Amino acid sequence: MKGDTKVINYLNKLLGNELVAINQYFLHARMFKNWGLKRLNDVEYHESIDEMKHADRYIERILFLEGLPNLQDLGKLNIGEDVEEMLRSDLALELDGAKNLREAIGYADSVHDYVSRDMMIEILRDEEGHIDWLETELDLIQKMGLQNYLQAQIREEG
């Protein structure tokens, strides 16, 4: 079904966001794993899988709408060298994507692409979830201190 061009541009832009997130989350995950921070590896890995699911949904939708999914261009990764810096970087990234999602959703509504909108709102709900988790972790680091926070990541949560 031939979709609205600008919706497809938005879908590719959102896809672009998820594909930086996929990589940034995966590197973070295995960095944590290397450091023995088993629990942060588990969560961030699962967030990488999450963003993959999102990318998949965009790709399928762009294809359905008869556009060309763009997996060639990759935005700036910001990796960071310590836990806080890396968590903070994932948070900034989620925040910029939420912003883009809010914009795309409003526009999809105005051209009547209600199913693209509906798919985007579910994705935003997952992002808003990641935002919740990242914010909480960052606050825990301040409240309990860095040493205690690290000790609490050594064992995976059952």
Q: Which residues contact 109 (CB under 8 A, 6 or more apart)?
A: 117
State which of positions 26-85 bind ligand HEM (CB under 6 A).
26, 49, 52-53, 55-56, 59
Q: Which stretch binds ligand HEM (CB under 6 A): 19-27, 34-42, 80-88, 93-101?
A: 19-27
* Dihedral angle computed from the Cα positions of residues 77, 43, 29 and 147, in that order, rounded to the nearest 10 degrees: 100
Alpha-carbon distance 145 to 35, whole Å? 18
Half-sphere exposure of 10 (CA within 13 A, CB side): 24
Q: Is 120 annotated as a binding residue?
A: no
Query: Considering the complex, what minimum distance in angstroms separates the CB of residue 135 from a copy of itself?
Result: 7
- Report if residue 23 touches ligand HEM, rule: CB under 6 A: yes
Residue whose C-alpha is closest to residue 70's, from 84, 59, 80: 59
Integer angstrom CA distances of residue 141 from 78, 83, 86, 151, 152: 20, 9, 13, 11, 10
Alpha-carbon distance 28 to 2, whole Å? 38
Per CB under 8 A, residues contacting a copy of itself are: 1, 19, 23-24, 26-27, 30-31, 33-36, 56, 59-60, 63-64, 68-69, 71-74, 76-77, 79, 95, 102-103, 105-106, 112, 114-115, 118, 121, 124-125, 128, 131-132, 135-137, 139-140, 143-145, 147-152, 154-155, 157-158
Nearer to ligand HEM, 53 or 112 (CB): 53
Q: Point out which residues bind ligand HEM (CB under 6 A).
A: 19, 22-23, 26, 49, 52-53, 55-56, 59
